[PDB]
Design an enzyme around this catalytic site. Structure first.
Site: not given
Ligand SMILES: O=C(NCc1ccccc1C(F)(F)F)c1cc(-c2ccncc2)nn(-c2ccc(F)cc2)c1=O
Ligand SMILES: Fc1ccc(-c2c[nH]nc2-c2ccnc(F)c2)cc1
Length: 329
Positions: A31, A158
């Site tokens: 979340s 992602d």
């Molecule tokens: O959670 C994620 N992003 C969002 C995020 C993160 C942190 C802080 C707040 C947020 C919010 F708030 F934007 F969601 C993220 C997760 C995973 C992942 C990978 C492998 N296994 C599971 C999950 N990968 N990418 C990702 C990044 C670059 C890329 F080229 C491809 C994917 C993400 O952005």
């Protein structure tokens, strides 16, 4: 250790450092809350992972995720501002929180002018060159995975069916697909930005491929020679042969150079698609392309993917990454 404070947020507790204030729930997958980071004066996004260590699979996913986000250091890829746990030792370690820049909106919320498409597609390719240079395949490129601020500045992340942006070889379940599946997705997004319509809105995987082959044609002889699967071949060869459509006709009215690039991205045979690095030098991006400002990535060690470890082991590894984190300048 900084000072933490606890609050409940929608049947979900949050223990964050005092540096992060005014937490406001923002949507769910982990979340996420919006916050204000008092250290930098910036709006941040804080994600609390759910059950990061419930199973060996979640544990390894958690490690995956943190290692990946720690490595991505590029203007058009989401970067990690901070990572923390309220745990004071490995023993008590259960929760992981990730902090990133709060992004304005996604591409999903926004037919665009040709210059807007140029700039947005340019930034995607520039980020993907970087990602691909570390031997990572994104695999889930789609408008909702692109964060775009009010300046049209774009970052890949992602977090509208995923399948609509998926490469036909993945639909066909080819085991050895490679990084060019991401170029396929970018072609589908580019088309959607030019026309305002999803290019291949398949209702399932069969319908997905059917719509794909309608545009790009059924496999030619060169591509059929590369298919090992007898069943796949019976499928393919048993289809009514369709010619590749004329992309000029199909995208009539669109900048001919955008048409040319779409032809180069949505080639059916993945061995023939333009790479991200090549696409950057394409004439459609002459306004933007700068060969000396399209960096590649530091080597990325993904050897842990082949490893079978106990939950506590992946948990220990993740804790090590938390502890070793050095924030960005
Ligand atoms: O959670 C994620 N992003 C969002 C995020 C993160 C942190 C802080 C707040 C947020 C919010 F708030 F934007 F969601 C993220 C997760 C995973 C992942 C990978 C492998 N296994 C599971 C999950 N990968 N990418 C990702 C990044 C670059 C890329 F080229 C491809 C994917 C993400 O952005
Ligand atoms: F109907 C089809 C037939 C082939 C593809 C395809 C596109 N690029 N590469 C392939 C491919 C290569 C090797 N083995 C496979 F199984 C698939 C996609 C849909």
């Amino acid at each position: 250790r900084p000072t933490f404070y606890r609050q409940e947020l929608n049947k979900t507790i949050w223990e964050v450092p005092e540096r992060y204030q005014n937490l406001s729930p923002v949507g769910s997958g982990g979340s996420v809350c919006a916050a204000f980071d008092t250290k930098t004066g910036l709006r941040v996004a804080v994600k609390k992972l759910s059950r990061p260590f419930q199973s060996i699979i979640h544990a390894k996913r958690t490690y995956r995720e943190l290692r990946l986000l720690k490595h991505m250091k590029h203007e058009n890829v989401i970067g990690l501002l901070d990572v923390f746990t309220p745990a004071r030792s490995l023993e008590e370690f259960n929760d992981v929180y990730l902090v990133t820049h709060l992004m304005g909106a996604d591409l999903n919320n926004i037919k665009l002018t040709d210059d807007h498409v140029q700039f947005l597609i340019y930034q995607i390719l520039r980020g993907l060159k970087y990602i691909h240079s570390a031997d990572i395949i994104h695999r889930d490129l789609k408008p909702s995975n692109l964060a775009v601020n009010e300046d049209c500045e774009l970052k890949i992340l992602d977090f509208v069916a995923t399948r609509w942006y998926r490469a036909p070889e993945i639909m066909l379940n080819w085991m050895h697909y490679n990084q060019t599946v991401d170029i396929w997705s970018v072609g589908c997004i580019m088309a959607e930005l030019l026309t305002g319509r999803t290019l291949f809105p398949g209702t399932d995987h069969i319908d997905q491929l059917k719509l794909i082959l309608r545009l790009v044609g059924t496999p030619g002889a060169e591509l059929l020679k590369k298919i090992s699967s007898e069943s796949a071949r019976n499928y393919i060869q048993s289809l009514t042969q369709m010619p590749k459509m004329n992309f000029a006709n199909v995208f009539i009215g669109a900048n001919p150079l955008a048409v040319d690039l779409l032809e180069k991205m949505l080639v059916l045979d993945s061995d023939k698609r333009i790479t991200a690095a090549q696409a950057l030098a394409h004439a459609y991006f002459a306004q933007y392309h700068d060969p000396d400002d399209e960096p590649v990535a530091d080597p990325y060690d993904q050897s842990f993917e082949s490893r079978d470890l106990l939950i506590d082991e992946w948990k220990s590894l993740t804790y090590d990454e938390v502890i070793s984190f050095v924030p960005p300048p």
